DNA sequence: ATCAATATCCACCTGCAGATTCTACCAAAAGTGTATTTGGAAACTGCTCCATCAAAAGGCATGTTCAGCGGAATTCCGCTGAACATGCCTTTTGATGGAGCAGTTTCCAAATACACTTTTGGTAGAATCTGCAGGTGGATATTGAT
DNA sequence: ATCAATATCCACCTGCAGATTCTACCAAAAGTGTATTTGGAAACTGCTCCATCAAAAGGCATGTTCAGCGGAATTCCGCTGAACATGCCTTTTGATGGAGCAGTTTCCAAATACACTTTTGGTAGAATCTGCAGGTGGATATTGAT
C-alpha cells in the first residue's frame, strides 16, 4: 500500500468492466444600507459609553421613593449617568480599594475634583464645538442614541442632589467586596474557570491636522443647511 | 444672513484640496 | 511453536545469512552487524514487494494470468517514485509506454 | 554451480496474491533488479561508514542508506517497514 | 517608548480612517441630491447632520493622546 | 484501387509499433555489423548468441531514447519534420560528446 | 449547562457547561445581545442597555453582501472587549477551545442576516495571524440561536476564497467537532466533484490543491472517501462512478446559493508586530 | 566487410516509428548510422576490455553487460 | 523564524545568464529559473542534512556538501 | 545623453563575464535563502561558512550549465532571446531524474 | 633506498598501497600492483600539470589562479571527459560566442 | 593528524618547468582531481577483480582498469609510462 | 451525409513449449553453543567558531521611461517525402563438423603478519621575499548620426 | 565616406598579504628481514557449443505520383533592452557572546571465530496440465468519394 503523487491522469467514462415573544419592546427602528460597503473603526465602548447600570434593587429607591415631593425632577437617566460618574471618579485617584471597601473615602474631601473632572477628557467635544459653534444645540452622534435631545449635564446636580446619590453607592460595594455590581469577569489572570524618528516621520502632526481643519467646514456645509431650515 | 457664510469657505476646501490631496 | 527458527523472526521470506554474506563480500572495511542487517532484509522485501504487487495491477489488464516482461516495463514505468528509482534501467523486450505528444495529433 | 534468488521473489508473489504466474525472463528481470539495488545500497553504506570515522557497518548506516538511495514515500514505507522487521527480532521471549 | 510602535498604532487606525473617510463623507453627499429637488420636510437634514457631525468625531478621538507622544518622549 | 488519406497510416503504425515488444533491427545484418566493429580491435572474437542479442537490445533502447529526444527537440522547433540538427541538439545536450 | 440562554427569540439551554460563572453561580436567566451581545444575567442591566443601543452592525469591515447573509473582518486587539465577547457565546456552544489566553491575536471572521431590524451575528470562525497548520479554519460554529438553514455550510464556501487570495493553502486544525465531522467532508467532497465535471483533460495532484487549494494530505484522504482514485488501469485513474450522475445534476437542477470569486473587497493585509 | 548501411530505411523507420515521429527526412539516415556506429565503438570497446582481461577468446553476455553497465546504460534480463 | 518569502532573490538572473552565453532574455523566466533552483537547493539540502544526521552532528561541514554532491552526480571539486 | 545601439552593452557585458570569475549571486540573501530551505527539513542546525559558500557554488554551476543549453535551444529555435518552452525543453532534454 | 624513487617517480608508492588496503574488498594486492598505479597518477597529474603552462608569455602570470588550471583543462578535450564529472571552484568559463 | 599530497605535487611542478608558483587553493583542486581519480580506478579495480573471481588485487587488472577509466589516448601513453615503470622497478631486485 | 472499405477488436478452436511442481537426492551452507578481543555508548570538558548585534558607507537594486526591433502571424511557392505496386535479394529457418570454457588437479612465488630501526612529512614560528590587486596616465580600437 | 566621445591596452608603480623556504622537532608510520600459509600460474582434458552450408517467403528496393509541409517575405507591435535618479539592503568590521564540537578517558555489548550438525534450497527431470500464442469467423470503429 502506498500514497499516490504527482502528473497522473483522468479517464471519465471509456468502458471499464420556541420563538421568543418579549423581544418587541427590545430592538425598535430601522437601519439604511448603502451601495458601499460599511466601513467602521470605533470600539464598543464607545458604542455604550456610560459603563453602569443599576438594576431592579436600587432604582426602586431612586424612581418611586426620591419623586413623592422631589423638587427638582429627578429622572432615571440622570440616575444613571451621574451615579456612573463617580464609579469611574473615585477609582482613578484612588486605584487600590480592592482590599478594603472599608476605606471607602469621603466625598468632602472629593468635592474640588470630580467638580473638576474630565473623565478620561469626557467633554472633549466643547472646546472644539467652540469652532462649529453649536452650541445652540449640543453635539449629537450616531453614537449617541435618540434618547438625549432632553438631557441636563453634571455638575448642577452634584450640589443640588448629588450628595446624595454616592450615599447609596457605597453598601453595595462592601458585600462585592470593592467592584462593579454585575462584576467585571474572570480578569485577574488567564486562570481557571468558575535615530529612524529623525529624518521621515517628524510630520506626523502635519499629516492629518489637513483633515480636522477641513473637518468642521465640511460640517459647515451641511451646517449652512440646519440654518437654512429655520 | 444665513447664507453670507455660504459664500466663501466653498473655495477653502478646494485651495485645501489642492494643497495636499492633489499634488 | 517450536524452540528452533531460520531466522524467521522478521515476518520475511527473504534469507538472512545470504545477504549478510553478500553484505560480508563488499569488505569495505571490517566488521558487519548480523542481528541488524534483517533490517536490511526487509528494505529489499518491501520495494520488492510493491513491485510484484504492481504485477497483479496490470495481470488484469487483459485477463493474463502469467507475468511477462513487456507489461513489467509497463508497471515500473508508471509508478513515478519507482521510475526513478529504475530510470538508468532498460528493461529488455519491455517495449516504450504509449504517448502521442499531443501536438502532433491535429485531428487530420 | 549457482545460487539464486528466484524461489524468494515466487514465494513473494504467492503470499501476496496466490494465483499469478511468472516468466523467467521477468525472473531474471527482477533478479537482477534486486542484486543491482542490493550492489548500490551496499556501497552507499559502506562509503557511509567509511567517512563518518566508524569501523562497523550497524542499522543506523543501513537506515541512512535506504533513506538516501530511495526516493521519498516509499523510502518513508521502507523504514517503517525495516524499523518493524528488526524490532521484530530483538523479541526474543519464551514464546 | 519609541518610535518604532509609535508609528504603528498610529498607521492601521488611520489606515481605516481613510477607508471612512472614502467612505463617510460619500454616504453624506449621497442623499442631499434629493435636498434639490426637495423645492422629511424638516427631518431629513437632521439625519445627515448627525452621521457626519460623526465624522469629526471619530478623527477627533485619536487626538488626545496623539500629541502626548509627541511631548512625552522628546522630554 | 483505392487508398485513404495519405499521411495518416503513419499513426496507425506508431499505434501497432507501440503495442508490440519485438526487437526490430534484424539479426543477421546486426550480428555482421558487431563483428565488423569487432575485427578492428582484435581477429576472431568468438561470440555468445545472448550476448549479441543483448547488444541488439541495448542498440534498440538507446537509438528509441534518442529518437523520442529528436521528436521532442523537433517539435519544439514548431516543425513536424526532424533533421539534422534536431538529432544534433538531441545529442550534444543529453551529455555525449 | 447552566440557566438556558434566552437571547434574539431562540432560548437556548447551552450544550457546554461552565467558562462564564465566576459571579454568575446565582440566577435563573442569562440574557445576550446582537451586536454587542453583552452578558447580562439581569434584566435591568439589559433593558437599560438597549436603551443605551447605538451599535446597529458589528465592528469591522465588510467583504460580503450576498441576498441572503453577510461578511465581516474584526481582529481581537483593535476591539479588546467585544472579540471576547463572543469569545464566550461559542464556548457555551463548543467546548474544544482554549481560554488559556485572553484570546488577543488572531482576526475573527463572523457573519449575519440582513433584517431591517438589525442584523443577527449567527455564526464565526477565528483565524490566527500565522500559518503552522495552515490555519484557513480555526474555531467555526453555526449556532443553535438559528441552525436549522445550511448557510452554516456556507461559512466553508466562504472559508477558501479566503485561501484563494491569501494565496497560501490551508486546512482547520486537530480537534474536529462532531457537528464540523460531517460538514467538513460535505464541502471537500462536493468540491472535488465541481473541478471534474469541468476540466476535460487531465489532472495532477499540484493543480487540484492550487485550482483549490485544499492540502494534498487532505484532498488526496478525500479522494478516497469518494471512491475516485482507482489503480490498475495504466495509471491512476479517475473513473465516473454513476452516482456522479445525479450530483452534478444536483448541483445543476437543484442548485444552491453559493459565493463569488470576484466580488471581495478585501486586500491581504502587512504586519509589522507580532 | 561494410555493412553500416546493411541497417536498412524501413529497419530505422520503423524504429523512429516507435520513438513517436511522423516526418523522416531523406538523409537523417547517414547520422543515424554514424551514432549508431558512436554507440557500437563505445560498447564494443570495453567488452574487448572485459573480455581480454578474463583471458577469454569468446565473449560472453556477462562481460557485455558490466561494461554496459560501467557507461551508464544497464540493462535488465541478461545478466 | 524566518518563514518568508526570500524565494525572491534578485534579478540578477541578467548577471549569471551573462555568464551564460545568452543574448536578451524576454522575461518571465525568472519565475521558473527559482522554481529551479529551489528544487536543486532542497535536493541537495536533504542529502547534506541526512549526512549531517547520521554523524550526530548539529553542524553541516563542507565535506557534506561535497559528499551529497559527490553521489548527485555533480562533484564540486577542491572544496575539501 | 549619449545611448548605444540597444543590443551592444549587451555584447559588452556578454564579454565581461565571459571574462569573469566574480562570485554572481550575493552571499547574503542566498545564505538566508540555504537557512530557510534547511530549517523544515530538521529545526535549528549550525551552519559553517564554507558550507554556505559551497552550496553558492555548486548553485551558480549548475545554473549556468542550464543557461548555457538553454541557449543553444534558443538558437536551435530560429530566435535570439529564451523563454519558457525553451528551458523547459532543456530540463526535460537534461533528464532531472 | 626508498621504495618511492625504486620505480623512478616521486608519489610515494608505500602510502598509496596502504590507502589501496583501505580501499580493499578482495584484502590482497602486491607491491608491484602499486609501481604501475603510483606512476599512473604521476602521469594524469603531470599531464594536467604541464599544460597549464598555457598563454604565459603574453601575461606572464608567474603564479595560476583557479581558473588557469580551468581554462585549458578544457581545451585539452581529451581531459574534458575525465573531468566531466567535475565543477571546478570559482572557475568560470571558456570564452565562447554562440 | 593532517594528510595531504601537496608537496608531491609541488615536486611535480618542479619536474616540469619549475620556475612558478601553486596558489593553495589551486593546490586543493589538484588534490581533490588526483584523490578522485584514485577513488574511480580503486573502486572499478576492486570490482573487476571481484567479479572476475580471483583475490589478489593485480597489476594487470590495473592495467585493465587503466585503459577502460580513461579516453583513449591518454591512456594509451598512460599505459606506456606505467609499464616502462613497473618494468624499471621490477629489474632491480 | 451516407454508405464503402478496411482493420480494430472480440469471442472462440487448437497445438504445443513451458512454467511448474514434486519428488528427491544431496553439496553446501545457516543456526547453534560457546570462548574471546575490541569497537563503541557516552560521559565530562575545554574552546573554537558560529550567532547575533550593531553602525556607517556605499555599490548596486529597482521602478519609470522610451525607442525600435526582434518575435507571432499570413500567405504562397516549390519540393521532398509518404504511399501503392512490382519485382527480388536476402534472410529466416532448418541441417552437420571442430576449438576453447569450464573444471580439476600440482607447486612456488609472492603478501600477510611481526618486531624492529630510522627518515618523511608534517606542522607552526614567521622571517623574509616579492608577485598580484588595484591605480593611473599616454596612444588606440570602436561604434551612431550625417 | 566621416566626425568624435567612450572605453581599452600597457608601461610604470605602490602596497601587503600570500607563498616559500627554512630550523626545531617530532613522531608516526614506511623499509628490512623472517616463516607460513596460499592462491595464482600452468598443464591437463570433456564436451558442450560455436562455427559454417541448402529451401520458401517476406519484407525490402525502387520506382511514379500527389501533395501537405518546410521555409521565405513582409508586415506589425508588444516587449524589452538601456538610463536616471533614487533608496536600501549589503558589505564590511569590530566585537562581543554562547554552545555544539572533538577530544581523552572510559568501562561493557557484541560481532568474530572456532567446531558441529541437520536441514535445505539447487537442480533434474518427468508428469501432466495448460496458458497462451496462433489461427479463424465476425460485430464494428473510423473515416474517404461526391
Redesign the interface.
Given at each position: 500500500r502506498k500514497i499516490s503523487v504527482k502528473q497522473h491522469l483522468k479517464i471519465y467514462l471509456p468502458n471499464d468492466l420556541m420563538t421568543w415573544n418579549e423581544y418587541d419592546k427590545f430592538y425598535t427602528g430601522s437601519f439604511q444600507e448603502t451601495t458601499s460597503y460599511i466601513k467602521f473603526s470605533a470600539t464598543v465602548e464607545d458604542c455604550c459609553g456610560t459603563n453602569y447600570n443599576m438594576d431592579e434593587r436600587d432604582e426602586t429607591f431612586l424612581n418611586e421613593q426620591v419623586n413623592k415631593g422631589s423638587s427638582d425632577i429627578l429622572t432615571e437617566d440622570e440616575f444613571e449617568i451621574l451615579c456612573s460618574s463617580f464609579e469611574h471618579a473615585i477609582h482613578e485617584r484612588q486605584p487600590f480599594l480592592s482590599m478594603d471597601p472599608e476605606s471607602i473615602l469621603s466625598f468632602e474631601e472629593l468635592k474640588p475634583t470630580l467638580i473638576k473632572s474630565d473623565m478620561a477628557d469626557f467633554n472633549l467635544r466643547n472646546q472644539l464645538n467652540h469652532e462649529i459653534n453649536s452650541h445652540k444645540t449640543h453635539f449629537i452622534t450616531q453614537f449617541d442614541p435618540v434618547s438625549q435631545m432632553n438631557t441636563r449635564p453634571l455638575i448642577q446636580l452634584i450640589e443640588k442632589f448629588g450628595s446624595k446619590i454616592y450615599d447609596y453607592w457605597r453598601e453595595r460595594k462592601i458585600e462585592v467586596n470593592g467592584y462593579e455590581i454585575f462584576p467585571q469577569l474572570k480578569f485577574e489572570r488567564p486562570g481557571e474557570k468558575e535615530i529612524l524618528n529623525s529624518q521621515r516621520l517628524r510630520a506626523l502632526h502635519q499629516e492629518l491636522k489637513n483633515a480636522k481643519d477641513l473637518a468642521l467646514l465640511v460640517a459647515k456645509r451641511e451646517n449652512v443647511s440646519l440654518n437654512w431650515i429655520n | 444672513e444665513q447664507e453670507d457664510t455660504f459664500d466663501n469657505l466653498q473655495q477653502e476646501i478646494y485651495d485645501k484640496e489642492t494643497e495636499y490631496f492633489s499634488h | 511453536l517450536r524452540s528452533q527458527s531460520s531466522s524467521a523472526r522478521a515476518g520475511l521470506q527473504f534469507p538472512v545469512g545470504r545477504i549478510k554474506r553478500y553484505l560480508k563480500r563488499h569488505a569495505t572495511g571490517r566488521t558487519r552487524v548480523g542481528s541488524k542487517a534483517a533490517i536490511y532484509l526487509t528494505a529489499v522485501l518491501e520495494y520488492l514487494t510493491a513491485e510484484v504487487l504492481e504485477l497483479a495491477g496490470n495481470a488484469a489488464k487483459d485477463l493474463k494470468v502469467k507475468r511477462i516482461?513487456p507489461r513489467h516495463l509497463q508497471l515500473a514505468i508508471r509508478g513515478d517514485d519507482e521510475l526513478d528509482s529504475l530510470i538508468?534501467?532498460?528493461?529488455?523486450?519491455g517495449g516504450?509506454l504509449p504517448?502521442?505528444?499531443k501536438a502532433?495529433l491535429l485531428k487530420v | 554451480r549457482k545460487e539464486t534468488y528466484s524461489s524468494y521473489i515466487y514465494k513473494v508473489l504467492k503470499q501476496t496474491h496466490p494465483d499469478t504466474g511468472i516468466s523467467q525472463?521477468s525472473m531474471?528481470?527482477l533478479n537482477?533488479?534486486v542484486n543491482?539495488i542490493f550492489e548500490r545500497i551496499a556501497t552507499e553504506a559502506s562509503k557511509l561508514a567509511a567517512y563518518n570515522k566508524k569501523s562497523t557497518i550497524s542499522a543506523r548506516e543501513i537506515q541512512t542508506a535506504v533513506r538516501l538511495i530511495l526516493p521519498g514515500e516509499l523510502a518513508k514505507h521502507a523504514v517503517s517497514e525495516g524499523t518493524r522487521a528488526v524490532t521484530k527480532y530483538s523479541s526474543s521471549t519464551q514464546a | 517608548m519609541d518610535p518604532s510602535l509609535v508609528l504603528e498604532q498610529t498607521i492601521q487606525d488611520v489606515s481605516n480612517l481613510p477607508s471612512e473617510f472614502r467612505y463617510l463623507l460619500e454616504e453624506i453627499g449621497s442623499n442631499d441630491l434629493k435636498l434639490i429637488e426637495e423645492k422629511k420636510c424638516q427631518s431629513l437634514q437632521r439625519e445627515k447632520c448627525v452621521l457626519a457631525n460623526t465624522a469629526l468625531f471619530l478623527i477627533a478621538r485619536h487626538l488626545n493622546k496623539l500629541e502626548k507622544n509627541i511631548a512625552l518622549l522628546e522630554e | 484501387p483505392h487508398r485513404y488519406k495519405p499521411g495518416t497510416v503513419?499513426l496507425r503504425?506508431?499505434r501497432r509499433?507501440?503495442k508490440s515488444t519485438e526487437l526490430?533491427?534484424?539479426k543477421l545484418?546486426?550480428q555482421?555489423?558487431?563483428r565488423?566493429?569487432?575485427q578492428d580491435?582484435?581477429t576472431?572474437?568468438?561470440?555468445?548468441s545472448?550476448?549479441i542479442?543483448?547488444?541488439q537490445?541495448?542498440?534498440?533502447?538507446?537509438?528509441?531514447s534518442?529518437?523520442?529526444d529528436?521528436?521532442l527537440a523537433?517539435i519544439h522547433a514548431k516543425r513536424?519534420?526532424?533533421?539534422?540538427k534536431d538529432?544534433?541538439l538531441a545529442?550534444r545536450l543529453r551529455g555525449?560528446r | 449547562n447552566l440557566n438556558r440562554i434566552i437571547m434574539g427569540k431562540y432560548e437556548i439551554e447551552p450544550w457546554y457547561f461552565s467558562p462564564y460563572p465566576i459571579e454568575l453561580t446565582d440566577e435563573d436567566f442569562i440574557y445576550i445581545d446582537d451586536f454587542t451581545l453583552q452578558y447580562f444575567g439581569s434584566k435591568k442591566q439589559y433593558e437599560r442597555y438597549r436603551k443605551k443601543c447605538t451599535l446597529r452592525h458589528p465592528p469591522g469591515n465588510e467583504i460580503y453582501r450576498d441576498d441572503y447573509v453577510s461578511f465581516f473582518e474584526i481582529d481581537g486587539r483593535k476591539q479588546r472587549t467585544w472579540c471576547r465577547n463572543l469569545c464566550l457565546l461559542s464556548k457555551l456552544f463548543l467546548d474544544h477551545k482554549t481560554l488559556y489566553y485572553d484570546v488577543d491575536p488572531f482576526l475573527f471572521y463572523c457573519m449575519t442576516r440582513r433584517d431591517e431590524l438589525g442584523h443577527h451575528l449567527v455564526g464565526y470562525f477565528s483565524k490566527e495571524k500565522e500559518s503552522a497548520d495552515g490555519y484557513n479554519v480555526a474555531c467555526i460554529l453555526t449556532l443553535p440561536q438559528y441552525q436549522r438553514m445550511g448557510y452554516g455550510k456556507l461559512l466553508i464556501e466562504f472559508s477558501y476564497e479566503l485561501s484563494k487570495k491569501e494565496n497560501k493553502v490551508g486546512s482547520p486544525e486537530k480537534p474536529l467537532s462532531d457537528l464540523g465531522l460531517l460538514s467538513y467532508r460535505a464541502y471537500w467532497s462536493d468540491t472535488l466533484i465541481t473541478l471534474l465535471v469541468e476540466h476535460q483533460k487531465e489532472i495532477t495532484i499540484d493543480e487540484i490543491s492550487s485550482m483549490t487549494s485544499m492540502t494534498t494530505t487532505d484532498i488526496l484522504h478525500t479522494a478516497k472517501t469518494l471512491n475516485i482514485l482507482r489503480y490498475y488501469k495504466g495509471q491512476h485513474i479517475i473513473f465516473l462512478n454513476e452516482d456522479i450522475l445525479d450530483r452534478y445534476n444536483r448541483l445543476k437542477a437543484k442548485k444552491r446559493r453559493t459565493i463569488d470569486p470576484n466580488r471581495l473587497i478585501w486586500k491581504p493585509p502587512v504586519f509589522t508586530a507580532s | 566487410?561494410?555493412?553500416?548501411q546493411?541497417?536498412?530505411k524501413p529497419?530505422?523507420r520503423?524504429?523512429?516509428?516507435?520513438?513517436?515521429?511522423?516526418?523522416?527526412?531523406g538523409?537523417?539516415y547517414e547520422?543515424?548510422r554514424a551514432?549508431?556506429?558512436?554507440?557500437?565503438?563505445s560498447?564494443?570497446?570495453?567488452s574487448?576490455?572485459?573480455?581480454?582481461?578474463?583471458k577469454r577468446?569468446?565473449?560472453?553476455?556477462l562481460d557485455?553487460?558490466?561494461?554496459?553497465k560501467?557507461q551508464?546504460?544497464?540493462?535488465?534480463?541478461?545478466?
Open positions: - | - | 516482461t538508468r534501467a532498460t528493461i529488455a523486450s516504450v504517448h502521442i505528444n502532433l | 525472463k531474471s528481470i537482477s533488479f543491482d | - | 503513419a503504425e506508431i509499433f507501440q526490430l533491427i534484424r545484418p546486426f555482421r555489423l558487431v565488423e566493429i569487432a580491435f582484435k576472431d572474437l568468438r561470440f555468445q545472448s550476448a542479442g543483448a547488444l537490445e541495448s542498440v534498440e533502447a538507446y537509438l528509441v534518442l529518437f523520442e529528436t521528436n523537433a513536424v519534420t526532424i533533421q539534422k538529432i544534433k545529442r555525449e | - | 566487410r561494410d555493412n553500416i546493411g541497417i536498412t529497419a530505422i520503423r524504429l523512429a516509428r516507435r520513438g513517436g515521429v511522423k516526418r523522416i527526412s538523409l537523417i547520422e543515424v551514432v549508431l556506429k558512436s554507440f557500437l565503438e560498447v564494443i570497446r570495453d574487448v576490455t572485459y573480455t581480454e582481461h578474463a577468446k569468446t565473449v560472453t553476455s557485455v553487460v558490466y561494461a554496459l560501467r551508464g546504460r544497464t540493462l535488465y534480463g541478461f545478466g
